[PDB]
Amino acid sequence: DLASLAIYSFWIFLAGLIYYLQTENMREGYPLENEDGTPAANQGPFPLPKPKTFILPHGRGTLTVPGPESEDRPIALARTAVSEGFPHAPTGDPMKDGVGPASWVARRDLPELDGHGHNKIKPMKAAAGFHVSAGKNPIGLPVRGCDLEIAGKVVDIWVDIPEQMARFLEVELKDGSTRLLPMQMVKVQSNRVHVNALSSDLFAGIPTIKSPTEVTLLEEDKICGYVAGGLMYAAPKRKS
Amino acid sequence: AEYQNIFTQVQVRGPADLGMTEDVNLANRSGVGPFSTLLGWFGNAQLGPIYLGSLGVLSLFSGLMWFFTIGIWFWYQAGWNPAVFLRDLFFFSLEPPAPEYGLSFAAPLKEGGLWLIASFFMFVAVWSWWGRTYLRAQALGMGKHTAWAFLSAIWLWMVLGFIRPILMGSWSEAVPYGIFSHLDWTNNFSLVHGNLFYNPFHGLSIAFLYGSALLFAMHGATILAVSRFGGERELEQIADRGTAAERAALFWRWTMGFNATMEGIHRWAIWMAVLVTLTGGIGILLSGTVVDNWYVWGQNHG
Amino acid sequence: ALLSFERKYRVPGGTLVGGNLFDFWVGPFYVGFFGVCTFFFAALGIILIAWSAVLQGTWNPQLISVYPPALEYGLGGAPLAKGGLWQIITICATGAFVCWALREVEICRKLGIGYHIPFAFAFAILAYLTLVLFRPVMMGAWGYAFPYGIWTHLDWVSNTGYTYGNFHYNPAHMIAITFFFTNALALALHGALVLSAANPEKGKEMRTPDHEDTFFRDLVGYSIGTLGIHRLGLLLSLSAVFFSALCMIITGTIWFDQWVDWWQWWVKLPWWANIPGGING
Ligand code: BCL
Ligand code: BCL
Ligand SMILES: CC[C@H]1c2cc3[nH]c4c(c3C)C(=O)[C@H](C(=O)OC)c4c3nc(cc4[nH]c(cc(n2)[C@@H]1C)c(C(C)=O)c4C)[C@@H](C)[C@@H]3CCC(=O)OC/C=C(\C)CCC[C@H](C)CCC[C@H](C)CCCC(C)C
Ligand SMILES: CC[C@H]1c2cc3[nH]c4c(c3C)C(=O)[C@H](C(=O)OC)c4c3nc(cc4[nH]c(cc(n2)[C@@H]1C)c(C(C)=O)c4C)[C@@H](C)[C@@H]3CCC(=O)OC/C=C(\C)CCC[C@H](C)CCC[C@H](C)CCCC(C)C
Ligand SMILES: COC(C)(C)C(=O)C/C=C(\C)CC/C=C(\C)CC/C=C(\C)CCCC/C(C)=C/CC[C@H](C)CC/C=C(\C)CCC=C(C)C
Ligand SMILES: CCCCCCCCCCCC[N+](C)(C)[O-]
Ligand SMILES: CCCCCCCCCCCC[N+](C)(C)[O-]
Ligand SMILES: CCCCCCCCCCCC[N+](C)(C)[O-]
Ligand SMILES: CCCCCCCCCCCC[N+](C)(C)[O-]
Ligand SMILES: CCCCCCCCCCCC[N+](C)(C)[O-]
Ligand SMILES: CCCCCCCCCCCC[N+](C)(C)[O-]
Ligand SMILES: [Fe+3]
Ligand SMILES: [K+]
């Protein structure tokens, strides 16, 4: 019966597909590891796919995956138990050390580029013709942390040139220097910008970038990771 | 009230963005359209430019001819009366030839001929539009994933209006052009074949249709949850995994025991959706050609 | 075992209940208080289904069916074999689902990410409760809820739908289907677009988001963008289920005649109700 054959053949194809799809999703993070970094004995029933290679534009090289996986950074954590499966306690300050919800990945210390080879993200004062076109302009507002103290003032917007969206606020601190705050982690109000993730005393520890007109992928991760980590680690200073 | 990144707080605008060039014929690109602040609360504010070569003009012209052919017949059915037009808009219907004309083209204009004219225009519009999805990707050097996926939608449509009518032996099997009538056709199609709930390909079709909403709710929510680490910049997260892609993977690993990659999730996505119409078109195509009654069929090959 | 980058995220903290009592993992799975609850509700619920599968008397998945209480029982209890198992299994299912979501909230807090995922899942949970709880209570009987059986639940969909004619004519059902269809269309496009950029013609460099915007603008004259498309997928799927639940919550309560006849309010509007011609004159 032709319909019986079609449906039998389809369930076979589907098993091949799910196999294909599961192995394609192993191109990062595998082989699995024990908590100490060595290969785990049990890798699951799916083998690693044959490697593929992405050609990155603008002379940035290639990426071959799967490939040798290394964290390429120290991890300030220690076991809390004598067997696998338990949490790992920060051995120092987890916001400063970049662990837990404050983690960051060692991405390349170059900026992301648009399709023409220019830096994807620029402060708006350096982006010819870019300006605020709708909603409340935050530039000039004071910045309040979750301890309800003022931590600084907005001095610019860092914008995504090819996609024309705001990605960061540049905030000036009491000592004259500035920091980037992720746009998705601030609330623009009529008389202030409010940041629930950080208390005012935590603003100075936000990782700093090395150039006033560009930010690298490595720096964005340290910034985004640090701000998000305040949700957990600044809770003792958050009010209601 | 914590921010959720469903709607934009602050829109910024810059010079109109004219696009990448690669091998595109810039003479066929329009100028840039207006900017919509409304859209900019949710997505991009920029409209245009659009590309309009020969294929695109051909497609737009047949597509409008298809529409206008239906709309003239609707006015005829209204006796040219505007209030009757508006009142009965969803009840009008442009229907295919009666069974006795088979696959021929003899049927009179008012009794199926007009349906075949409209369908011819629709056929040319869709297939020429498919060529656009391939050629626009070629001109930019991109993969042809969009065009292959569009083929899966075209499959079901081809099966409904063309391949199954032909295999069944008459145009009367095809779908009529009307709001309520195409719903009536759909209910009647199931009743005449013994309830599609017994068609195992209709069940798969539903699983993937439900599954697409499942998966897009998951993926869309995940990306928005990690957009505080730039997670929607997915192409660079593929080239250089960030903390956004790692937290996304670990949410799902911790929740349900396995996870995706920033690239692989898009293979889950394209196949979830594509299998809706793939299994769908098979299920419809087998109906009446091979299986007269799915209830009956399930009694024997279940 | 851990993914190669996983250890740095496995810190204490995040839990809503129990402090650090359940703050640990089993292989890849996080546990937490709400994992213990989920496991309990789910284990019990499955046990009772395997039971019900003997009070009815078979071990065939395609036959096991746990029916709700008959309409005569109204909104009251019922003996296990006559609908009481269904009611207990429904409480377990609700508890497993709610606890699955709250466990997701705890995973969100440990990871420093937003709550969007469990928020979305809650829409699925409220569609389920519309069918098994809100609509049956509004109608007066557990018997209007669906049975837990692979094929018998489809039986329920047809019987319920045809009670009102062709169900196609429910206008909230129409909007729900429209969102489902546009969701699948947006999912095919979104997956194809990212992949066509990451996997260009043989030997080419990876394309950028700028190419993805250019592609869609060339194709249709508008590109929603990489933030927008993810917003869109969430909105379309969530709207599909919202209008799904709405289309059923009003069926058999505020509207209970044949849905096709609902549309007469339009046709019978005074200024054209009596103009002859067309289909309805
Ligand atoms: C949603 C509106 C209607 C309805 C109408 C239909 C119609 C119409 C069809 C289905 C189909 C299915 N439905 Mg139903 N169904 C409803 C409510 C439910 C509920 C629920 C708790 O609310 C569940 C779990 C299911 C489950 C299922 C599957 C058996 C099947 C494929 C779904 C799928 O892939 O989705 C997308 C989800 C995924 C891809 C993720 C994986 C989900 C897996 C498959 C669910 C397995 C559930 C298992 C069999 C039973 C519980 C297991 C317990 C441990 C005991 N339905 C209500 C009553 N359902 C189809 C079928 O083939 O039925 C035979 C079909 O044609
Ligand atoms: C009483 C009614 C019958 C029934 C009769 C049918 C019939 C008949 C069919 C389906 C089919 C479908 N059914 Mg069923 N169905 C029933 C009950 C259900 C239930 C339910 C809860 O009970 C559900 C969830 C479904 C779900 C679905 C989908 C899985 C499937 C369609 C996929 C799709 O994307 O189509 C939408 C997508 C398309 C139509 C493809 C369109 C592609 C073309 C190329 C686009 C051209 C555009 C054109 C140019 C116009 C442009 C306009 C401008 C843009 C403005 N059915 C009952 C049993 N169902 C189909 C199927 O595959 O079944 C196996 C089908 O043919
Ligand atoms: C994989 C399964 C899903 C799928 C996939 C899919 N569809 C696709 C694609 C893909 C991958 C495309 O590449 C292609 C596309 O270009 O999308 C932007 C397409 C597309 N799917 C479309 C529609 C569509 N897809 C549907 C469904 C599905 N598409 C599935 C759910 C459905 C239904 C019934 O559910 C519809 C209606 C189009 C948007 C587009 C194909 C366009 C096409 O063929 O155009 C030819 C026609 C013309 C060029 C002109 C037509 C003229 C109009 C009738 C004018 C009248 C409008 C009037 C002036 C106003 C009307 C009201 C409002 C607009 C104001
Ligand atoms: C709101 C948009 C869509 C949505 C979203 C969504 N679903 C989600 C999520 C999200 C965002 C999750 O995070 C969550 C998840 O973890 O996904 C992997 C989930 C999920 N959606 C699921 C299923 C699912 N979603 C569906 C649909 C939808 N999900 C919507 C369309 C459907 C259907 C029919 O369309 C199904 C079947 C699961 C894979 C998962 C939730 C898993 C869970 O809660 O696990 C805890 C409970 C158990 C492991 C077992 C409980 C068993 C019971 C105690 C007994 C059985 C009772 C049941 C009523 C029997 C029914 C019999 C059937 C034959 C009808
Ligand atoms: C204001 O009024 C004016 C006149 C200005 C208008 O413009 C008003 C216009 C309208 C009111 C139009 C309204 C249109 C509709 C209601 C259309 C609705 C359509 C549907 C619901 C479509 C249902 C499904 C359609 C399908 C399945 C079509 C299949 C098409 C085939 C695949 C094509 C096959 C080709 C054939 C038969 C031709 C054969 C000949 C060859 C040479 C190939
Ligand atoms: C319907 C989609 C769900 C299918 C299940 C996919 C296979 C899950 C196995 C994942 C393997 C996890 N592991 C051990 C490799 O890490
Ligand atoms: C959803 C919106 C899609 C609409 C498509 C808009 C195309 C823009 C064309 C604008 C033409 C401008 N100009 C100067 C050439 O006339
Ligand atoms: C080709 C014309 C380009 C510029 C058009 C600008 C449109 C007006 C700008 C404000 C947008 C307000 N609105 C209502 C259109 O959203
Ligand atoms: C421009 C239309 C292209 C030809 C395909 C459509 C064929 C329609 C035939 C209509 C019937 C004509 N006639 C004389 C039998 O009435
Ligand atoms: C690519 C994702 C694959 C997910 C697979 C979903 C399987 C759903 C099972 C539905 C069963 C339908 N049928 C006809 C056998 O009854
Ligand atoms: C088709 C729906 C049924 C799929 C449910 C099973 C999901 C598998 C999750 C397994 C987790 C991986 N593993 C082996 C480490 O447990
Ligand atoms: Fe995505
Ligand atoms: K500027």
Author numbering:
A (entry chain H): 11 to 250
B (entry chain M): 1 to 302
C (entry chain L): 1 to 281
Question: Which sentences did the original study use to describe this structure?
Answer:
The photosynthetic reaction center (RC) of the purple bacterium Cereibacter sphaeroides (recently renamed from Rhodobacter sphaeroides) is a photosensitive membrane pigment-protein complex that serves as a convenient and informative test model for studying the mechanisms of electron transfer, photosynthesis, and pigment-protein interactions. The RC from С. sphaeroides consists of three protein subunits and ten cofactors arranged in two membrane-spanning branches, A and B. The RC contains two bacteriochlorophylls (BChl), PA and PB, combined into a special pair P, two monomeric BChls, BA and BB, two bacteriopheophytins (BPhe), HA and HB, two quinones, a non-heme Fe atom, and a spheroidene molecule. Of the three protein subunits of C. sphaeroides RC, M and L, are pseudosymmetric with respect to each other and have 5 transmembrane α-helices, whereas subunit H has only one transmembrane α-helix, which is mostly located outside the membrane on the cytoplasmic side. Here we present an approach for stabilization of the photosynthetic reaction center of Cereibacter sphaeroides, which is the formation of disulfide bonds between its α-helices.
In two intra-subunit mutant forms A(L172)C+L(L246)C and A(L37)C+S(L99)C (pairs 3 and 4, respectively), the formation of disulfide bonds did not occur. This can be attributed to the fact that these cysteine pairs were too deeply immersed in the membrane and were therefore inaccessible to the bacterial disulfide bond formation systems that promote the oxidation process. In the case where the mutant pairs are located deeper in the membrane part of the RC (pairs 3 and 4), no bonds are observed, and the side groups of the amino acid residues are turned away from each other. According to the data obtained, the mutations made for the formation of intra-subunit disulfide bridges (A(L37)C+S(L99)C, A(L172)C+L(L246)C, and A(L53)C+I(L64)C) did not contribute positively to the stabilization of the RC but, on the contrary, had a destabilizing effect on the structure of the complex.
